[PDB]
Design an enzyme around this catalytic site. Sequence first.
Site, PDB file in Angstrom:
ATOM      1  CB  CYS A  24      -9.866  60.393  23.066  1.00 42.70           C
ATOM      2  SG  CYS A  24      -9.259  61.539  24.372  1.00 42.70           S
ATOM      3  CB  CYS A  27     -12.468  61.129  16.871  1.00 36.30           C
ATOM      4  SG  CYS A  27     -13.707  62.427  16.720  1.00 36.30           S
ATOM      5  CG  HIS A  28      -8.477  58.986  18.314  1.00 38.32           C
ATOM      6  ND1 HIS A  28      -7.702  58.986  17.184  1.00 38.32           N
ATOM      7  CD2 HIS A  28      -8.442  60.250  18.779  1.00 38.32           C
ATOM      8  CE1 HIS A  28      -7.227  60.202  16.977  1.00 38.32           C
ATOM      9  NE2 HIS A  28      -7.664  61.013  17.925  1.00 38.32           N
ATOM     10  CG  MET A  65      -6.257  66.140  17.077  1.00 40.17           C
ATOM     11  SD  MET A  65      -6.974  65.204  18.404  1.00 40.17           S
ATOM     12  CE  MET A  65      -5.673  65.560  19.676  1.00 40.17           C
ATOM     13  CG  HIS A 304     -24.880  51.608   7.503  1.00 34.58           C
ATOM     14  ND1 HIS A 304     -24.082  51.786   8.610  1.00 34.58           N
ATOM     15  CD2 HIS A 304     -24.866  52.783   6.827  1.00 34.58           C
ATOM     16  CE1 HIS A 304     -23.598  53.005   8.620  1.00 34.58           C
ATOM     17  NE2 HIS A 304     -24.062  53.638   7.538  1.00 34.58           N
ATOM     18  CG  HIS A 347     -24.329  54.655   1.886  1.00 29.78           C
ATOM     19  ND1 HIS A 347     -24.803  55.938   1.782  1.00 29.78           N
ATOM     20  CD2 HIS A 347     -23.809  54.545   3.133  1.00 29.78           C
ATOM     21  CE1 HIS A 347     -24.587  56.595   2.907  1.00 29.78           C
ATOM     22  NE2 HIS A 347     -23.983  55.775   3.743  1.00 29.78           N
TER      23      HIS A 347
END
Lengths: 526, 529
Positions: A24, A27-28, A65, A304, A347
Site C-alpha cells: 500500500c 500509492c498511499h 485502487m 527533479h 518540468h
Amino acid sequence: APEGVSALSDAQYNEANKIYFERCAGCHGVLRKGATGKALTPDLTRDLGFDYLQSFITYGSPAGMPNWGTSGELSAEQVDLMANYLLLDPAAPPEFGMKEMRESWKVHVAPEDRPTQQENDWDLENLFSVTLRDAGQIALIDGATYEIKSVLDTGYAVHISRLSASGRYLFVIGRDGKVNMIDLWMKEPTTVAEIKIGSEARSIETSKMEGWEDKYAIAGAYWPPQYVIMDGETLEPKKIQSTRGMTYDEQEYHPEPRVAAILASHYRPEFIVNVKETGKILLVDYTDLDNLKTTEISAERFLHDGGLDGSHRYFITAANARNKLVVIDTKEGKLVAIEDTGGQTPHPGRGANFVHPTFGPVWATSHMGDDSVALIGTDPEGHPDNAWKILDSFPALGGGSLFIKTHPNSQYLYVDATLNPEAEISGSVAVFDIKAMTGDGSDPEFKTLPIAEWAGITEGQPRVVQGEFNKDGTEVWFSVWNGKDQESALVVVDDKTLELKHVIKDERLVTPTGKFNVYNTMTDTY
Amino acid sequence: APGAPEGVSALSDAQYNEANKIYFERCAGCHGVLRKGATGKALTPDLTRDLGFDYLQSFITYGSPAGMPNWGTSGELSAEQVDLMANYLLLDPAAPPEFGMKEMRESWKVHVAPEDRPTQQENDWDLENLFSVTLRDAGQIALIDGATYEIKSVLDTGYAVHISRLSASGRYLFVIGRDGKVNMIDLWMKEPTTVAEIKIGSEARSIETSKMEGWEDKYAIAGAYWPPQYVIMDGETLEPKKIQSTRGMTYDEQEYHPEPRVAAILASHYRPEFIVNVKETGKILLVDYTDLDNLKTTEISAERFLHDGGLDGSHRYFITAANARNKLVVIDTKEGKLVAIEDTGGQTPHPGRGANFVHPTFGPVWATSHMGDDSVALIGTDPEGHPDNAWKILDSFPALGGGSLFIKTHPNSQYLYVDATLNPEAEISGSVAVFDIKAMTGDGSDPEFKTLPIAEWAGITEGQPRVVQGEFNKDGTEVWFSVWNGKDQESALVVVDDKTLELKHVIKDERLVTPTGKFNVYNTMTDTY
Ligand code: DHE
Ligand code: DHE
Ligand code: HEC
Ligand code: HEC
C-alpha cells in the site's frame, strides 16, 4: 458515541504492517499521507469507519485502487486486518536493505537459458513501451502497424520504462519500487527477473557508457532514501547507497532526501543521480563497487527531472520549486551553471534539444506553473556567449504543461498542457516551427492540434500527455489519458504534415500514460 | 505524573530545554549522548534513581579527583543549574540533537584574525623539538622544550582534552577534546595562545591536517562520534567549510546503520586527501579536498570496527586495526583501494600510529602490540622489493604483558619500545619492554627484551602510576614516556637515552597533572614513526 477500535495482537499487527509497507505505501505514502492514493491517516479514516474501509479494500475503485479482496490478493481475514490497521496510528517506516531485496529477488529465466539472438519477428527498435497506469501493465506496440504486440503484467503502480544500451532488455519500475526486467529477444517476451528496492520509488536507468552495455541497472527510491546498483542481467543487488545527508546550502542534516531522476553518462562509466531535498547531484562510478568512487556535486534543492544536451556531454536538470536549471559537465565531473528560467515550475521531462536558427544548439523546457517555454544555449565551444544562458522565453497553450518534445529529423517543437483546467486546452498540443524562429524577441507562433478531438473522445476528462517519436523521427505519438472506466487512446501525428495519421484504441488500452520508443530511449535521442 | 507514586519532580518545558542544552554541550563528552557513559559513569534512569537527587546534586557540585569537574564549587554552574541537572538525570534520556552548520558557526570564534598574526616566529623556542603534552583531567596542554626539558607553557583548551596534531609546516597546533571542542594555537606568537576555536559535535576523538606536498596549512579535519559526521575546516581560521554525514550501509551485510562513528583520521602524502575511518559500517573514506563543491571521495569497503592505524615507512600504505576482529586492514592511498586484510593472531590490536622499521631478515615492517595479550605482531610493508612478505604477518612474539597500548621506534634507533599501560600488575604497567632490532633473526624463537622500570625511575610512590606511550625527540636520540597518575597525585615524564637505554631525565612539576598523550612537533608534522 464513536465506534470502538479493535485491539490487534502483535502477530496481527506485524502481518498488517508487512502488507502495508509492501503493498500500500506505493500509492498511499510510507506515513499514510498519500501519493497517487488518498491519505489514510486516522484523523480521516476514523470518520470513514471500519465498514467503509473494508468495502473499499474489498472492491477497490475504478479510479486506481486495486480490488484487493475481490481479486484474491488479500483473503477476507487480511482485508479486515488492514481495515483495522488503518484505524490505528501510523507505524514507523522500515528500512529495506540487502536481506529484504534478496528475499524479493527472483530470476525466472537464468541467463544461460535465454535466447542467444532475437527469436521473434518484431521490429524491436521501433517498439513503443506504453504505461497502462491503473491496470498494472505495459503494452508493447508496433511503431509501424500500430498493432498491440503484447500486454505485460508488471505490478500495480507501474510508472515508466527504460531500455538497456543494447536494446534487448526492457526495465520497468513501479511506484512501490518493484523492478521488472523483460527480455525482448524471446519468442514471447516476458519477465525474466524481478526485485523490489524499497517502499516508494520512481526511477530506473541502465549503463550507457560504451563498453558497459547491459552491465548494470540502477534504481532510486523515495523511501528509504537510497539507490541500488543491480546486475544488468539478473537484477542481483550489488551495492546499496544511502542518500541521507546534509543539504548543500544550509548544511543541515536531512533524514529523507528522495532520489528523483536518474540518467547515465556517455563520457564515463557513471550513473547521474539527482537527490531532491539536499540539492546534490551524484556521479557514481560503477567500475569498482567495493572501492567506490563518487562525485557529490552541490547544486540546487528540489532537483527533479532533466536530460542530456545534444552532444550527450552535459546534464541539464530542473530544480523545479526554485525555477532553476542546473548544468553539469559529465566529462570533468563539475557544476557548470545555474540559471533561472523566468517561468514557474519548469518540468522538462528529458527536455528537447535542437538547433535554433540564430542562437545555435539549445535545450528547451515548458512549465507547470505557466504557459512559458524557455531555451538555454548548450554549446560553449561554438557559441560561448549564449552558453548556459536563457536565450528566449515564449508562451504556448497555457499552464499545466508537462512535456516538450522534438527529434533530430523534425523541424517541429511539440508542447502539451496536460494539467490545464480548461478541457479544450488539456486536450490539445501546441506546435512550433523551429525553422521559423528568429530570436528577435517576438513570440513565435504555434499551431494547435486537437488531439483529443481527433481521437473522438469527449466524455470524462481526457487529458493529452507526452509526445514520443518513432525510430525514424517521422511520427510522434500522444496519449489521450482518460479514466479506467472511460475510453482512452493513442493519437499518432504525421510530423511532415501535422495531420492525424492514426488513432489507437483497444479494450485493453487502459489509462495509457508514458510511452517510450526502444531506440530513442536506448540512445537518449531527444 | 509528578504527584504519582513513581513520579519525579518534573521540570517545566523551558527548564528541560536548559538542562538538555547543558547536558549535550558540557556532559555528553564524558557521559555519552544516550547517557550510557564513556570516560564518566553511566547516568541512565535505572542507576540514577537508586542514587537519588541529593547524591547526584552533591556529585555535580563537588566532583571528584577521578575526573569529574566540580561544577558547583568552581562557579561553572549556578546552584540552580546543578539542581536542574540533578532532576534531569532522573528523567528519561533525551533524543541526541543534530549539529549542523548553524550550530558550528555559532560556536566559531576567531580570537586573532590571520592578518594580525606574526609573519615569522617571534619567540626563541626550538619549535620543531617541542612536545605538546595532554593534561587529561586538567583540561589543558603543556608545551615542553625537547632539549632543556622545561615547561615553556600551559594552555587551557577545555575539559576532556584528547590529543594534539600539527599542521604540515609546524606553525599551527591543533588540539581536540572528547566533547568535539577544537582549539587552534599559533606557535609563532611571542606567547603562543588559542587564536581560533569551534565545536564540531557532541562527542569526538580525531583531528588531522592536510599533508599533501603543496597543501600545507590549507585544511584541518575533525571526526565525531556524535553526530555521525566529519567536517573540513579552513586551516587558518577553523571556518567550517564542508560537513559530511557518515550514516550509511554496513560494508558486509549492507544494512542501514544510523550511528556510524568516525575513528582515526590520517592524511595522504600521495594525493590531496584525508583518510577517514568509519567504525561501525567498516568503511575507509578517501576525501579529496581540492574541490569542496564538487566533492570526490572513495568509499572503501574494509572490515567493521576500524579504530586506529598509521602509514608505513614509505607513507603510501595505510595500515589500520579493525580491533574487535583482530585484523589489520591495508589501503593503497596512491591507487585508492583495499590491498589486504590479515589476522594478527593476537587479541585486540592497538597500535596507535604503529612502528615502522627495517627487520634484518624480513625487510620493511610495521609493528603493533595488543590490548588483550602480550603479543607483538609484524606485517611486511614492501610489495616492491619483498613481494612474498608484503601484507603478511611475518612474526609474533611476547613483550611485558597484556593491556598494551603503544609501540614505538624511530629511524635513528635500533630499539623497539612497547608499553603495558592497562595490565593488572603494577609491576608491569609501570615498566617498558625494549627489543634490539638488529638482533632479530625471524627464525621463530622469541626475541628477548630489556625491561625498563620507567615508573621506578620517576621515584613515585603515591596512587597508581601507569606508563603510557613513547615519543621521540626531533633527532631521534631520546624517547619520552608518561607516568600517568591521578589528578591529585604526582605524575611525571621520563626521558630515556636511546643509545644506552639509561635514564636521561625525569620531568616533574606542580602543573604536570595527569600527563598522557605526548606529541613531538617535528615527528608529528612529518608522520615519522
Ligand atoms: C522522479 C520521476 C521521474 C523521472 C524518472 C527517471 O528519471 O527514470 C518521472 C518521470 C516520468 C515520465 C518520463 C518521461 C520521459 O520522457 O522521460 C513520465 C511520462 C511520467 C508520467 C507521470 N508521472 Fe512521473 N511522477 C513522479 C516522479 C517522477 N516521474 C512523481 O513524484 C509524481 C509527480 C507523483 C507520483 O505520485 O508518482 C509523478 C506522477 C506522474 C504522472 O501522474 C504521470 C503524468 C503519469 C503516470 O504514469 O503516473 N513520469
Ligand atoms: C579514535 C581515537 C584515536 C585516534 C585519533 C586520531 O587519529 O587523531 C585515539 C588516539 C589516542 C592517542 C594518539 C597516539 C598517537 O601516537 O597517535 C593517544 C595518546 C590516546 C590516549 C588515550 N585514549 Fe584516545 N581513546 C579513544 C579514541 C581514540 N584515541 C576512545 O574511544 C577511548 C578508547 C575512550 C574514550 O572514552 O575516549 C580513548 C581513550 C584513551 C585513553 O584512556 C588514553 C590512553 C589516555 C587519555 O588521555 O585519554 N588516544
Ligand atoms: C495504487 C495502485 C494503490 C495501491 C497499491 C493501493 N491503493 Fe488504496 N487507493 C488508491 C487510490 C487511487 C485510491 C482513491 C480511489 C478513488 O476512488 O478516488 C485509493 C483509496 C483507498 C481507500 C479509500 C479511502 C477514501 O478516502 O475513499 C482505502 C481504505 C485504501 N485505498 C486502502 C488501501 C490499502 C489497505 C492498500 C494496500 C493493500 C491500498 N489501498 C493499495 C490507490 C492504491
Ligand atoms: C569529563 C571531563 C567529565 C565531564 C565534562 C563531566 N563528568 Fe560527570 N563524571 C566524570 C567521571 C570520570 C565521573 C566518575 C568519578 C568517580 O569518582 O568515579 C563522573 C561522575 C559523575 C556523577 C556521579 C555518578 C556516580 O555513579 O557516582 C554525576 C552525577 C555526574 N558525573 C554528572 C555530570 C554532569 C551533570 C556533568 C555536566 C555538567 C558532568 N558530569 C560532566 C567525568 C565527567
